[PDB]
Amino acid sequence: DRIATNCCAGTKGCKYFSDDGTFVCEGESDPRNPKACPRNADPRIAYGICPLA
């Protein structure tokens, strides 16, 4: 479904794409380094293909 987020807030591995159909970015939420950006949402972030396993 549709998800409001950004490259930084996005879950690692999950690849978010825009409404335009172009690949935007995968979540850079690497577990090795502490990071969290739930204080912004990219307008082109329409949906993201998150890994099930």
Rg from Cα positions in the chain: 10
- Give burial (CB, 10 Å; 0-12/13-18/19+) of 50: middle
For the domain spanning 1-53, the CATH number is 3.30.60.30
Which string of b and e fits 2-39 if b means at least 16 CB within 10 Å? Answer: eeebbbbbbbeebbbbeeeeeebbbbebeeeeeeeeee
Output the CA torsion sign for 34, 40, 42, 48: positive
Q: Are 9 and 40 in contact (CB under 8 A)?
A: yes
Q: How was this structure determined?
A: NMR
Q: Measuring CA to CA, which residue among 21, 29, 30, 34 is closest to residue 5?
A: 29
**Euclidean distance between CA atoms 35 and 47, whole angstroms:** 21
Cβ-based neighbour number of residue 49 at 10 Å: 12
